[PDB]
Design an enzyme around this catalytic site. Structure first.
Site, PDB file in Angstrom:
ATOM      1  N   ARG A 127      17.219   0.545   2.471  1.00 39.86           N
ATOM      2  CA  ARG A 127      16.105   0.957   1.611  1.00 39.86           C
ATOM      3  C   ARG A 127      16.559   1.482   0.237  1.00 39.86           C
ATOM      4  O   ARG A 127      15.890   2.330  -0.361  1.00 39.86           O
ATOM      5  CB  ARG A 127      15.259   2.026   2.317  1.00 39.86           C
ATOM      6  CG  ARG A 127      14.842   1.703   3.756  1.00 39.86           C
ATOM      7  CD  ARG A 127      13.746   0.642   3.843  1.00 39.86           C
ATOM      8  NE  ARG A 127      12.850   0.892   4.975  1.00 39.86           N
ATOM      9  CZ  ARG A 127      11.809   0.129   5.308  1.00 39.86           C
ATOM     10  NH1 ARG A 127      11.513  -0.973   4.620  1.00 39.86           N
ATOM     11  NH2 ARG A 127      11.058   0.467   6.353  1.00 39.86           N
ATOM     12  N   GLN A 132      15.441  -4.056  -3.371  1.00 35.39           N
ATOM     13  CA  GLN A 132      14.004  -4.324  -3.217  1.00 35.39           C
ATOM     14  C   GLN A 132      13.681  -5.791  -3.499  1.00 35.39           C
ATOM     15  O   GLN A 132      12.810  -6.377  -2.858  1.00 35.39           O
ATOM     16  CB  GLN A 132      13.174  -3.424  -4.142  1.00 35.39           C
ATOM     17  CG  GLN A 132      13.036  -1.994  -3.645  1.00 35.39           C
ATOM     18  CD  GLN A 132      12.316  -1.087  -4.626  1.00 35.39           C
ATOM     19  OE1 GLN A 132      11.689  -1.551  -5.578  1.00 35.39           O
ATOM     20  NE2 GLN A 132      12.399   0.219  -4.393  1.00 35.39           N
ATOM     21  N   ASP A 135      14.340  -7.733  -0.357  1.00 33.70           N
ATOM     22  CA  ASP A 135      13.685  -7.239   0.852  1.00 33.70           C
ATOM     23  C   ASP A 135      12.547  -8.167   1.277  1.00 33.70           C
ATOM     24  O   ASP A 135      11.625  -8.423   0.499  1.00 33.70           O
ATOM     25  CB  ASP A 135      13.155  -5.819   0.613  1.00 33.70           C
ATOM     26  CG  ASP A 135      13.139  -4.981   1.875  1.00 33.70           C
ATOM     27  OD1 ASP A 135      12.314  -5.266   2.765  1.00 33.70           O
ATOM     28  OD2 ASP A 135      13.946  -4.029   1.969  1.00 33.70           O
ATOM     29  N   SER A 138       9.296  -6.117   2.705  1.00 31.49           N
ATOM     30  CA  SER A 138       8.477  -5.590   1.621  1.00 31.49           C
ATOM     31  C   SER A 138       7.588  -6.660   0.982  1.00 31.49           C
ATOM     32  O   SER A 138       6.382  -6.468   0.850  1.00 31.49           O
ATOM     33  CB  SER A 138       9.382  -4.952   0.558  1.00 31.49           C
ATOM     34  OG  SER A 138       8.785  -3.784   0.029  1.00 31.49           O
ATOM     35  N   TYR A 235      11.014   5.891   5.232  1.00 28.22           N
ATOM     36  CA  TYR A 235      10.153   5.540   6.371  1.00 28.22           C
ATOM     37  C   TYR A 235       9.808   6.773   7.213  1.00 28.22           C
ATOM     38  O   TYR A 235      10.442   7.824   7.090  1.00 28.22           O
ATOM     39  CB  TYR A 235      10.783   4.439   7.245  1.00 28.22           C
ATOM     40  CG  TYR A 235      12.240   4.646   7.609  1.00 28.22           C
ATOM     41  CD1 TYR A 235      12.605   5.430   8.703  1.00 28.22           C
ATOM     42  CD2 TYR A 235      13.254   4.040   6.870  1.00 28.22           C
ATOM     43  CE1 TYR A 235      13.943   5.613   9.042  1.00 28.22           C
ATOM     44  CE2 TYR A 235      14.593   4.218   7.198  1.00 28.22           C
ATOM     45  CZ  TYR A 235      14.931   5.004   8.285  1.00 28.22           C
ATOM     46  OH  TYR A 235      16.257   5.179   8.612  1.00 28.22           O
TER      47      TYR A 235
HETATM   48  N1  LIG Z   1      14.172  -1.170  -0.788  1.00 28.71           N
HETATM   49  C1  LIG Z   1      13.298  -0.159  -0.827  1.00 28.71           C
HETATM   50  O1  LIG Z   1      13.517   0.779  -1.576  1.00 28.71           O
HETATM   51  C2  LIG Z   1      12.074  -0.141  -0.002  1.00 28.71           C
HETATM   52  C3  LIG Z   1      11.607  -1.271   0.873  1.00 28.71           C
HETATM   53  C4  LIG Z   1      10.347  -1.089   1.647  1.00 28.71           C
HETATM   54  C5  LIG Z   1       9.729   0.083   1.485  1.00 28.71           C
HETATM   55  N2  LIG Z   1      10.173   1.016   0.715  1.00 28.71           N
HETATM   56  C6  LIG Z   1       9.411   2.275   0.632  1.00 28.71           C
HETATM   57  O2  LIG Z   1       9.285   2.907   1.913  1.00 28.71           O
HETATM   58  C7  LIG Z   1       8.006   3.540   2.036  1.00 28.71           C
HETATM   59  C8  LIG Z   1       7.325   3.065   3.311  1.00 28.71           C
HETATM   60  O3  LIG Z   1       6.893   1.713   3.147  1.00 28.71           O
HETATM   61  P1  LIG Z   1       7.005   0.641   4.343  1.00 28.71           P
HETATM   62  O4  LIG Z   1       6.037  -0.483   4.057  1.00 28.71           O
HETATM   63  O5  LIG Z   1       8.470   0.355   4.571  1.00 28.71           O
HETATM   64  O6  LIG Z   1       6.458   1.511   5.576  1.00 28.71           O
HETATM   65  P2  LIG Z   1       6.523   1.016   7.107  1.00 28.71           P
HETATM   66  O7  LIG Z   1       6.156  -0.448   7.187  1.00 28.71           O
HETATM   67  O8  LIG Z   1       7.815   1.499   7.728  1.00 28.71           O
HETATM   68  O9  LIG Z   1       5.312   1.894   7.708  1.00 28.71           O
HETATM   69  C9  LIG Z   1       4.033   1.852   7.078  1.00 28.71           C
HETATM   70  C10 LIG Z   1       3.478   3.244   6.785  1.00 28.71           C
HETATM   71  O10 LIG Z   1       3.030   3.867   7.989  1.00 28.71           O
HETATM   72  C11 LIG Z   1       3.107   5.279   7.797  1.00 28.71           C
HETATM   73  N3  LIG Z   1       3.048   6.005   9.095  1.00 28.71           N
HETATM   74  C12 LIG Z   1       3.934   5.953  10.125  1.00 28.71           C
HETATM   75  N4  LIG Z   1       3.550   6.746  11.184  1.00 28.71           N
HETATM   76  C13 LIG Z   1       2.385   7.322  10.836  1.00 28.71           C
HETATM   77  C14 LIG Z   1       1.373   8.263  11.387  1.00 28.71           C
HETATM   78  N5  LIG Z   1       1.528   8.795  12.620  1.00 28.71           N
HETATM   79  N6  LIG Z   1       0.289   8.584  10.636  1.00 28.71           N
HETATM   80  C15 LIG Z   1       0.062   8.097   9.398  1.00 28.71           C
HETATM   81  N7  LIG Z   1       0.904   7.238   8.795  1.00 28.71           N
HETATM   82  C16 LIG Z   1       2.093   6.827   9.501  1.00 28.71           C
HETATM   83  C17 LIG Z   1       4.409   5.461   7.027  1.00 28.71           C
HETATM   84  O11 LIG Z   1       4.433   6.651   6.255  1.00 28.71           O
HETATM   85  C18 LIG Z   1       4.457   4.226   6.148  1.00 28.71           C
HETATM   86  O12 LIG Z   1       4.034   4.555   4.835  1.00 28.71           O
HETATM   87  C19 LIG Z   1       7.215   3.187   0.784  1.00 28.71           C
HETATM   88  O13 LIG Z   1       7.166   4.312  -0.079  1.00 28.71           O
HETATM   89  C20 LIG Z   1       7.979   2.044   0.146  1.00 28.71           C
HETATM   90  O14 LIG Z   1       7.872   2.059  -1.269  1.00 28.71           O
HETATM   91  C21 LIG Z   1      11.257   0.940   0.015  1.00 28.71           C
END
Ligand SMILES: NC(=O)c1ccc[n+]([C@@H]2O[C@H](COP(=O)([O-])OP(=O)(O)OC[C@H]3O[C@@H](n4cnc5c(N)ncnc54)[C@H](O)[C@@H]3O)[C@@H](O)[C@H]2O)c1
Ligand SMILES: NC(=O)C1=CN([C@@H]2O[C@H](COP(=O)(O)OP(=O)(O)OC[C@H]3O[C@@H](n4cnc5c(N)ncnc54)[C@H](OP(=O)(O)O)[C@@H]3O)[C@@H](O)[C@H]2O)C=CC1
Ligand SMILES: NC(=O)c1ccc[n+]([C@@H]2O[C@H](COP(=O)([O-])OP(=O)(O)OC[C@H]3O[C@@H](n4cnc5c(N)ncnc54)[C@H](O)[C@@H]3O)[C@@H](O)[C@H]2O)c1
Lengths: 378, 174, 379
Positions: A127, A132, A135, A138, A235
């Site tokens: 991450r 990104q 990814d 994403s 996450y």
């Molecule tokens: N390379 C990178 O930097 C990179 C890649 C993907 C995501 N991200 C970041 O990571 C963060 C999460 O994104 P994602 O799509 O990977 O998430 P994810 O697919 O892992 O999960 C989706 C969302 O579910 C939420 N969640 C989990 N359990 C929960 C609960 N009990 N109640 C309410 N919400 C809950 C999490 O906070 C998350 O935002 C974002 O801010 C994103 O920008 C970064």
């Protein structure tokens, strides 16, 4: 050097790990690009256009992969047991980059290991900010978020936007999105586009500003314990029963007003957390829809069944599998460019070779096997 | 026999007003003046003035013509009000800023049995202190009838495009 | 004074001619509102909700209509010739109010006349601002136009809006709307707010402005011909085959880049004009869709088939029937509000009966048969 891309053989997989644009750059790196006949029909990517970009075309899958030094797939190769031994078609010793699903598919990993195949599981992309553009989680979860709203609108017997009319006011739909990740943020944007009122909630407190910038209203639950809920990679972690009941109660006020409910929550390693229970759907209005994007990981709603729209308690509960593939013609060129960006830094300036920098943590966190030796600490 | 007026004219009036109600119509859509309108809205709200939108059932040329365009300009739903729920407020309103609306306001719906617009319920813009009327000319609306409101002391005709006039009104304000 | 609202028996018809709001207003005007059970289950209006507003839930269609002075339904009653005598269930000398499609369906009018029922064909509502609140064409067309965009987005394999991402950019979809009436205008709106580039075209002069007012670009063809293209109530004419040729050629430049084409064009009485030929769908790129809202009356594209999503030449030609029913829960409370606004002024205040003024422009033009005799000039 030869790179190759077959048609996806798995049921309902209309994506392809290539685009005309991405072929252009691959030839500029010193590859011969071969693509299987009709590999990108489901993504509206024609044979003509691939060849126009500078690519040979094979008649069959085995013919494209026969002398292929590197191979790009979307979904993991099928093993002999599953129906068609695609792992055999890969040339011994070649490198293989795709969504391997490796942490839950050990059989397909060691089959590639038997043929000296160096397989890079793209879903394990760390991450870090600079990866990104590589990814696949994403790029695909973004389109999945949009698609959820389109699916809600399709399965919903009302219209999203507010319209004052001579026959009367048709009120705006009320969307409520659980989990404001990549998919959640897109769902909010898309539902707001269609004139809905969008509530949302998450454990991560950083997410609050994000929802409000898109025009949604946030549901606070545990202002104190939400700051102790984010990990290093960004996450979520497990919250336990205490928080699950303070959340299920705080969100119920809006859920009985909610028409469309999109649930996207995921916890890496563990199953998907239960955000809507069967007791909660009983309180919901009849004619409501629930879109469960986490259904292949257990689901945020236990009522949802993979590949099925489930009507219980007057509430349609959609649980489409492979949601990103329901937007294949966008998902594909984005998947192809994820792989182009992962591979590009490790291609020599003028040598015709793929020296995968083992020091690079993009390469270390991704490599499942190499030369018949499973390197990943699983 | 019509009291005309400029953008600076209308600027003075709404600045010195306790309550404005914006009455958008088909002309507002044609000029695409909804981003400029909600600007004029929240310069008035910033200085404390009470602003709301009065949407006639059949404003524009389709059901919800006004809604989708206001929604594009991010005017919040809480400020937007339907005819039956907002007609009383005109009494307690200094200004009815009628931007690109004509037939919707026409009182000939209740003072002319012969007129075709008769019967249809309208927005009582006349009940407000004074009424601004943005439209390019003296031409009639869809229904092709003269407006009684067009000429009488409580009314003012801002002649021109709805986007340029409303942008010129924001400039006259601060 | 009884008014009954049955269940819609026709296949693929989840709407109902009632809502709780209208039941409250009806009983308050002095009615006893009956309604068959399960009537609005496809529109999310439950039996309990109707009795809450002040209605009697009858068991069968016969029981509800048996002693009813007024009947409201959405689609025309079925006749004995169609296997189910719904008109038989209606009380002799009663008042029916529905979408009869009376001009194309002479049999149902003769069956309603043999029972001396006074039928009001709600689709013959004159186009006037006074009666736009009573107009079922508009309320249902509007939702059908929204639906067309929702359906096009569904069957289409790309996302409507432009997206700039870390993995790269995907372009927006390109929508082409043929026919810019009530339906097509709400289609231009729904597509444009979803972020698509929206082209549109029509044969009426005053349309170009209307398309631009929503934020789409217009495709002109013969600005000296669209001048005399409107008629009495804003409807369009036939244009021969010298215009059918001239439209397709200018349109063709934009149709080749079109992802989703929505066709709403429809002439009143006559069948639909062919705006997209098979030859034209050959030049459309694979992955495209055509939503045909005019399928139930010829179709603007001959390839489209009622109730089916046919796929020819790489193009998903969608052609669902009864599109406002695909939005039944919003479409119904509107439809009921139309029926209500038409009936309200004619309820004799201090007596609780009803008398339909003959000189009332809204009654004269909508009445099809009365006291056992066909009334409408064009029948
Ligand atoms: N390379 C990178 O930097 C990179 C890649 C993907 C995501 N991200 C970041 O990571 C963060 C999460 O994104 P994602 O799509 O990977 O998430 P994810 O697919 O892992 O999960 C989706 C969302 O579910 C939420 N969640 C989990 N359990 C929960 C609960 N009990 N109640 C309410 N919400 C809950 C999490 O906070 C998350 O935002 C974002 O801010 C994103 O920008 C970064
Ligand atoms: N909503 C619907 O479903 C439909 C409604 N209608 C009818 O539309 C009418 C609704 O009227 P309403 O919406 O109030 O407006 P009107 O249609 O009465 O007219 C609006 C006025 O704004 C004007 N205008 C046009 N372009 C511009 C511009 N660029 N800048 C400023 N003004 C402009 C015109 O005046 P000028 O040219 O002098 O500037 C016009 O007189 C009703 O009669 C209704 O029945 C008809 C069909 C469908
Ligand atoms: N007086 C009012 O307040 C009021 C309210 C609503 C509608 N209306 C009027 O009703 C009229 C009809 O609306 P509708 O939605 O029933 O239209 P419609 O269903 O008759 O047809 C839809 C569109 O198809 C177009 N069309 C027909 N043949 C064509 C061809 N060969 N090529 C291209 N386009 C073609 C027409 O121009 C029309 O706009 C409109 O003009 C509208 O202004 C009036």
């Amino acid at each position: 050097m030869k790179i190759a891309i077959p048609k996806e053989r798995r049921p309902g997989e209309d994506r392809v790990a290539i685009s005309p644009e991405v072929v252009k750059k691959l030839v500029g790196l010193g590859f011969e690009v071969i693509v299987e006949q009709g590999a990108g029909v489901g993504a509206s990517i024609t044979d003509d256009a691939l060849t126009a970009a500078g690519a040979t075309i094979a008649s069959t899958a085995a013919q494209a992969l026969s002398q292929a030094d590197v191979v790009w797939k979307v979904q993991r190769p099928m093993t002999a047991e599953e129906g068609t031994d695609e792992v055999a078609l890969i040339k011994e010793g070649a490198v293989l980059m795709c969504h391997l699903g490796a942490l839950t598919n050990r059989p397909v990993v060691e089959a590639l290991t038997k043929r000296k195949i160096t397989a890079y599981a793209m879903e394990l992309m760390p991450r870090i900010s600079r990866a990104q553009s590589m990814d696949i989680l994403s790029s695909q979860s973004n389109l999945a978020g949009y698609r959820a709203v389109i699916d809600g609108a399709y399965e919903f017997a009302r219209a999203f936007p507010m319209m004052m009319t001579a026959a009367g006011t048709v009120p705006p739909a009320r969307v409520l999105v659980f989990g404001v990740g990549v998919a959640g943020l897109q769902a909010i944007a898309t539902a707001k586009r269609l004139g809905a009122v969008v509530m949302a909630t998450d454990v991560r407190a950083a997410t609050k500003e994000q929802v409000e910038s898109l025009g949604g209203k946030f549901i606070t639950v545990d202002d104190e314990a939400m700051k102790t809920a984010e990990t290093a990679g960004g996450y979520a972690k497990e919250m336990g029963e205490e928080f699950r009941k303070k959340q299920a109660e705080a969100v119920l006020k809006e859920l009985v007003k909610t028409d469309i409910a999109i649930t996207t929550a995921l916890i890496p390693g563990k199953p998907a957390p239960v955000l809507i229970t069967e007791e909660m759907v009983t309180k919901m209005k009849p004619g409501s829809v629930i879109i469960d994007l986490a259904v292949e990981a257990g689901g945020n709603c236990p009522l949802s069944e993979p590949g099925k729209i489930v009507v219980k308690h007057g509430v349609k509960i959609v649980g489409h599998t492979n949601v990103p593939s329901r937007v294949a013609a966008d998902a594909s060129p984005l998947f192809a460019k994820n792989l182009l960006n992962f591979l590009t830094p490790h291609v020599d300036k003028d040598t015709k070779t793929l020296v995968m920098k083992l020091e690079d943590e993009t390469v270390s966190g991704t490599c499942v096997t190499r030369d018949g030796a499973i390197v990943h600490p699983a | 026999s019509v009291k005309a007026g400029s953008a600076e004219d209308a600027a003075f009036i709404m600045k010195n007003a306790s309550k404005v109600i914006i009455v958008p119509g088909y002309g507002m859509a044609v000029a695409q003046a909804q981003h400029a309108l909600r600007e004029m809205a929240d310069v008035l709200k910033k200085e404390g003035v009470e602003v709301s939108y009065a949407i006639h059932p059949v404003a524009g040329r389709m059901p919800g013509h006004m809604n989708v365009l206001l929604a594009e300009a991010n005017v919040p739903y809480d400020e937007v009000f339907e005819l039956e729920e907002i007609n009383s407020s005109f009494q307690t309103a200094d200004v009815a800023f009628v931007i690109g609306a004509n037939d919707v306001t026409n009182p000939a719906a209740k003072t002319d049995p012969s007129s075709p617009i008769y019967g249809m319920p309208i927005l009582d813009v006349e009940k407000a202190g004074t009424v601004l009327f943005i439209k390019r000319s003296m031409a009639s609306g869809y229904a092709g009838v003269e407006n009684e409101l067009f000429f009488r002391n409580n009314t003012m005709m801002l002649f021109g495009d709805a986007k340029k006039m409303t942008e010129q009104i924001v400039q006259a304000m601060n």
